[PDB]
Amino acid sequence: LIVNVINGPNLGRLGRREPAVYGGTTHDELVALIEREAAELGLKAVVRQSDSEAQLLDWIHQAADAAEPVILNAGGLTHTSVALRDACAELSAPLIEVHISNVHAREEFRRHSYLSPIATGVIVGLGIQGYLLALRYLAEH
Amino acid sequence: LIVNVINGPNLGRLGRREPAVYGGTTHDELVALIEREAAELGLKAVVRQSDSEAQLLDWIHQAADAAEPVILNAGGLTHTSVALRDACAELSAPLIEVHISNVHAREEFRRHSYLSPIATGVIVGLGIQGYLLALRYLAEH
Amino acid sequence: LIVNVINGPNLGRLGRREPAVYGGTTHDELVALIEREAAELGLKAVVRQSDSEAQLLDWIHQAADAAEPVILNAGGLTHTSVALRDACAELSAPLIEVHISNVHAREEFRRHSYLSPIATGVIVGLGIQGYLLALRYLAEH
Amino acid sequence: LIVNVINGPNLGRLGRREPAVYGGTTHDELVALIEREAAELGLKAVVRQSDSEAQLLDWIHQAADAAEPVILNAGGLTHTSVALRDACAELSAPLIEVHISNVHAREEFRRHSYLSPIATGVIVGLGIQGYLLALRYLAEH
Amino acid sequence: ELIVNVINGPNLGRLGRREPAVYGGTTHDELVALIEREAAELGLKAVVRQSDSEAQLLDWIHQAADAAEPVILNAGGLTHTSVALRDACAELSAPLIEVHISNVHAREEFRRHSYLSPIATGVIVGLGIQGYLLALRYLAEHV
Amino acid sequence: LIVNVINGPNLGRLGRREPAVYGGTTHDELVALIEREAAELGLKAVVRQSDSEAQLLDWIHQAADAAEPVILNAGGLTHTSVALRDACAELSAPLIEVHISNVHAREEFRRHSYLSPIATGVIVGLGIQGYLLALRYLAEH
Amino acid sequence: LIVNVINGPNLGRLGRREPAVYGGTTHDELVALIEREAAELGLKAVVRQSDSEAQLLDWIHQAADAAEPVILNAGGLTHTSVALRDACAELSAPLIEVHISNVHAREEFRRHSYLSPIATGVIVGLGIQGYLLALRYLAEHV
Amino acid sequence: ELIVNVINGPNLGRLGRREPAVYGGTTHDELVALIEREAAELGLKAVVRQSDSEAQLLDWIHQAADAAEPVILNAGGLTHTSVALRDACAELSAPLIEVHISNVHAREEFRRHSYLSPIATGVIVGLGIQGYLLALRYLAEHV
Amino acid sequence: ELIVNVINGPNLGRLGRREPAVYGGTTHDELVALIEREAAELGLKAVVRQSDSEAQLLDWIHQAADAAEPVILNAGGLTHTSVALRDACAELSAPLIEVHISNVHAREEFRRHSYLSPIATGVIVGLGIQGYLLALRYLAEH
Amino acid sequence: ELIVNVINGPNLGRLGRREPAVYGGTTHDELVALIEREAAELGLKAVVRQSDSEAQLLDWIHQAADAAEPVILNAGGLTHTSVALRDACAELSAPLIEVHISNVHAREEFRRHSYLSPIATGVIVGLGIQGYLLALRYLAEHV
Amino acid sequence: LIVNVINGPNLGRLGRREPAVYGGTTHDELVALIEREAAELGLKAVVRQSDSEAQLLDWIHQAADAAEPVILNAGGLTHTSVALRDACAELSAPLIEVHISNVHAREEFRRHSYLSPIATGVIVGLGIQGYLLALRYLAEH
Amino acid sequence: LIVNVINGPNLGRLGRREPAVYGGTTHDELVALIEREAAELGLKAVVRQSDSEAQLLDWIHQAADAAEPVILNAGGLTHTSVALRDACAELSAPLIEVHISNVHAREEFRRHSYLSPIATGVIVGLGIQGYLLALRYLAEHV
């Protein structure tokens, strides 16, 4: 039933943040779109956002304890955080990595995700809909 | 609206080919699943597979001229072919890269797609459903 | 005319912290010197320090919304944080990167700042006065 | 007299966290063993864990000001945090780096600790006892 | 009295017409005059020199080493290539400030690895023409 | 017992092709030598050559389904083709990589075969006899 | 005096293909322009294009057997194909590598040709005229 | 009507006696004469100059930028090492053709990474002396 | 009788006068006496041996593998270079503890990439001579 | 007739009990006897020698160079580390065949860059202990 | 027998230039020492110093034309100049590369001389006597 | 004044081994040439050669204890042995590295000596006279 959608640093800034790269959809609108999609798939979505690494670790620790699937857009921490990777290694339920922009069409340092090798799957560059497609995978699988 | 699903080398071997990596679904069954999904979304899917790089280039040139969206799993050529990349650079309509296995949880040489930097988006590790989720994105775009 | 001076990890430790590298000037002394210089330049300076990455992200988000220039010394996060770089990418007003020590005369890993490529300019190795020189540039711009 | 044992991200999760890698001992049980061993060696041990980088930095600053020895397991931050390295550089009393797992028998990125070069010594792969052996060194020195 | 050497390397005599979107529209002649005015306001005497010749640049910094005079150096393209220039700068006892008009870290990767930076007192980059003037102000506080 | 000898690009040119490197034996004479040696060992050798990657993949697919051993000299594709390595990964029967020249005594780029890590064994620099030695291995395995 | 001009993958697409990179001349027009220039220089150009590596290899083998010069634009295969390099190594008559675009002003991976080290020479970034200048090299060296 | 600058870098004045197995037996004087004869055939005016001095090469490039004239450049060894020379060439508005006598890709690895190639219009390598004349023919049909 | 083998490699017989700022002023003979005494208190028997010969070190490793005895190993310079010593240590079924006197990570870069660490049970570095004694304590508790 | 030197390096005397899943269950004594029989069937005389000492291996290679006898060499760990061994093998005028029991390319990265491979006639890898026998068969044919 | 001793950039600064690295012997004193050694060996030695690359090339050109041996300390140009290497490649008589300091005990960028591979031999770290020893080599050869 | 000349692996093979690389002078002739030159300089030279790393380490240890200068040609071990480098780090008297061939004109892996950074100086490619020139340095520096 329960799917955890977790957004990392700078993702609360969606809308005004680099619109050509990330789109004009706000995080509030993102939460509403995910919840609407989850209800139509018979799931429950809990969407959380934080710039704090310690907060992100706490949320996925809880998902590990509850054995709930995780949709994770770690933002910049994707490319840098071993600590977040280590937390995500506790997850028994599927972990789907999601990025709004095509991370492979940008700077070289964005192409070597710490999370990708331990995630079930990755969706990149499909904009805001990437979250919704990740939800659909978890509902159908 | 026509969507081109193009599969590269060894993808015609699906089902028998490394089941633990790629799953047990055959390419014939994949064709049927895509065509069923496309019919629900109001799209028309043309699914084709070849082990020949020249044939993949020909199919991509046609999609460039017709300005039709492309879903591409180039198999091994993903990691090697600059020629295929150059063919895909002609596409005006969206290009979605799809991989059945999590290419980032495997050998290091699989983590550096030549196609990702020029694709609209990439779906990795979500099995056969990656194709179907790519169709849904294209149904909204 | 508001200018934000943002200091990152370990900069609150100035004075006793590696004196041969960073000097004997405390953070409070630095705060006083900046405010004195800004007042003589007709600017208002707001100087804040935190060891928390999430906190630094918060302050630059504010400067982005208020369209205010930023003088940033991110400390160790300079060399490691993509998340901080992403937050700084929102800034429409000039961003000046400042370092007290000559970061190129030290360990090799300190020579590859994530912030330099997206900043307007960089001042390195001029001690505390680096902040004051960054202020003077902003007074003319 | 006073020894500071500081544990980084995900080390509060010991016990159920990757048992085959880190063992079945919880953090509560680890605190008890450390306190019992320190009392036998005529020392007082202060054991603290946090997933927050800023919190770790705060604890290091206090040890530097008090000139107290530090036994540090930074977790995933060991491989990533220059900020934590910088704080540890202020320590006048010995710094012993400790890891539960053999960090050299794992992923390549775990083999290049930021703390190792500025530490007095490093104990790796000797399990929970690594903490206790580090205590014994400090009792002799 | 208190003398500061401002030394510009290859292609810096071309300022104004040369890639204006990268280096600005101020000519080198205008830069010389601007530096001299700012220096005199700070109680300093700026000696501003430009050469496309490495040997000439070496000679100038050799003299600054003998006279123990501060140096503000924009070596241009040589910044990224010349060990010889670095070796000469290693003799300087008075402060050495490396200045670049453009933000070299926002450009090609080969520009991000200065040979001079590790032996300089400090580096000012990407602050345009004012970087020279700010370097002078540092030296005015550091006699 | 059937053994498949598969020769890749440029190997049909044996005889005239860089005689100092690859020898003076033609490809037709190679077929005759292998077939004579196979009859002596009580094996059945099918020797085939193609410059077409797709054709080589098809022959490997057939050997995978038939559970037949493969002796493969992929020529230039040894160093470049992930697609060919992917086809060879299907083989349940032993795969033995053969090269006429000493590929380690030439250009550096010839030293990093994609096939070697998944082959049973490799024979290099022993000339045309390398094929015959490979047959002899398979006759006892 | 026969000269083989061989074009690799995606070069049949000249005209529509990234005009800002490769120009607006079509492959049909390219063929005819090469043939006319060759004829004026007292040569005969055989111009062929294929997206198939095996086909390109066959044309190179034939050129090696006939000891005819090759002007080669391998396209994408320039940066990736050892098999093509191996075939070209059999050439004894001059081999000239030609690229329409300045391959050094683009992505890094385009700057490390497998063909360059074994070719007589390389012409890059001079557009369609690169083929014609390669022909003139051959005509001036008879 | 069109003026083209042929600029040769370090060691190119040594052509003829210099490593003949690599650069051929044509002297620099003979090269000048061959270029001027080809330029006269194409209806162009060719000015051929050679120097071992980097500063001198930079000066000639600056003049070509100011005059908006095409440049055929063989920088010799400086091709692989000089950012200063690259920066001067970036100021050119008329076409820049990089020319090398030897096949620079069939030699040492350090010769395969020209600083000038990315900012040039085109590059001709390994065709010997004729590389200069072919570069002239390109400029005759375009500029 | 639980036998622990303490094996020292090249230049460790030179302890005392050998770079005292790096390795301390304790001689190898004094080290042997300290290890043996510490082993006695823990209820173990320590066999301490040193050789500058790689072949000799390999023989001692082979013997310890056949006897299923724990090994405390300071391979010296060979730590950073010897695949052969790694291959021998791979036979050990009983725990292998890598010990270095100096902090090998605070020194030259080539000292930071041990061939032995990835196959050892654990590693003790930079704790001086006491690193041997702590390694014994680990084995006594295990 | 023809004398063939089969030289095994460090840890190969441990075959049988040493990592059976990697190197097989055949002991070194069993390997020696097998090689001797196979060679005698081919009209050759195999001298099989093993040592953990680099110096000892060098001496045996020196003797083969002076006698111009072929060498089959499994240097073990020294394959990936010893320039001294490569230098000794460079003296051999008769064929040198490098042999490894395990597929060294299916293992750790540091095992994939043999110092001996570039100077050997050929290499046999991953075919078990039969690799020695196939190497013998090559030498009997040449050649 | 005439020997050319050629010193490059910064070598005219000997004596006062980094005494701990290059010693206290001036360039004028070096010239006098070479004169004495040349007289003892029975040869002529011409000592030239220039900070100009073009000048150094000219002197090398003259030595090539006269087939005279060269002792070269190119200073900083040793590590940077392909042009100087190309000039030295013309020399038919022996070329001895000489450095006063041990270039291998300093910065990494000093360990990759462009001249070494085309020189007859190299003398490094023997101070000023390196010049005198190089002269003795040329007298005997 | 006693000077130690130490030759590593394969240097006993001089005259036989790759004569186009190392020359036609035997190690015995080298010994005699060194002893003659030492007598001219008022020095005593002890020239010893071994293919064994352990034996070379022992000789270096002896030279460290006696505070005697060392001329060292480690051969192949030059590029591989941290153990030998560690032994040489004990030397208080000067250490001169010598190579007969120009190590920088050969394979890349020969250009990164472990001994060079800790030696007083390095002499390369001056053939047999490299040893004699090394002797003259030590005689001039008392």
Ligand SMILES: O=C1C=C(C(=O)O)CC(=O)N1
């Ligand atoms: O590297 C990234 C990628 C992001 C995305 O595409 O979702 C967001 C972000 O803040 N940082």
Ligand SMILES: O=C1C=C(C(=O)O)CC(=O)N1
């Ligand atoms: O590297 C890959 C990845 C594939 C996938 O995951 O779809 C298929 C394939 O043949 N080769």
Ligand SMILES: O=C1C=C(C(=O)O)CC(=O)N1
């Ligand atoms: O790498 C750095 C550089 C700093 C500076 O020079 O201001 C401060 C800091 O905490 N970490």
Ligand SMILES: O=C1C=C(C(=O)O)CC(=O)N1
């Ligand atoms: O890379 C590591 C190593 C750990 C350890 O071995 O203690 C713990 C951790 O959380 N992350």
Ligand SMILES: O=C1C=C(C(=O)O)CC(=O)N1
């Ligand atoms: O790489 C650079 C940087 C320059 C600057 O920014 O001042 C000038 C220049 O000529 N070359």
Ligand SMILES: O=C1C=C(C(=O)O)CC(=O)N1
């Ligand atoms: O790299 C190689 C090696 C070959 C061989 O040695 O058989 C053949 C080939 O066409 N390309």
Ligand SMILES: O=C1C=C(C(=O)O)CC(=O)N1
């Ligand atoms: O890398 C390239 C270069 C091309 C060219 O410039 O001719 C063509 C092409 O298809 N791929």
Ligand SMILES: O=C1C=C(C(=O)O)CC(=O)N1
């Ligand atoms: O690297 C090079 C190449 C040259 C050429 O081929 O023209 C000439 C030169 O002096 N140095």
Ligand SMILES: O=C1C=C(C(=O)O)CC(=O)N1
């Ligand atoms: O690299 C090392 C480290 C040693 C240690 O710290 O014990 C000893 C040694 O001889 N070589």
Ligand SMILES: O=C1C=C(C(=O)O)CC(=O)N1
């Ligand atoms: O790297 C290796 C490979 C071996 C083999 O496969 O024969 C043996 C060995 O001791 N070390």
Ligand SMILES: O=C1C=C(C(=O)O)CC(=O)N1
């Ligand atoms: O890199 C070096 C080395 C020098 C030497 O050791 O003679 C002199 C110099 O100016 N630059």
Ligand SMILES: O=C1C=C(C(=O)O)CC(=O)N1
């Ligand atoms: O790398 C080398 C260099 C040698 C030399 O030139 O003296 C000798 C040797 O056996 N190995």
Ligand SMILES: [Cl-]
């Ligand atoms: Cl988007």
Ligand SMILES: [Cl-]
């Ligand atoms: Cl697209």
Ligand SMILES: [Cl-]
């Ligand atoms: Cl991806």
Ligand SMILES: [Cl-]
């Ligand atoms: Cl799957």
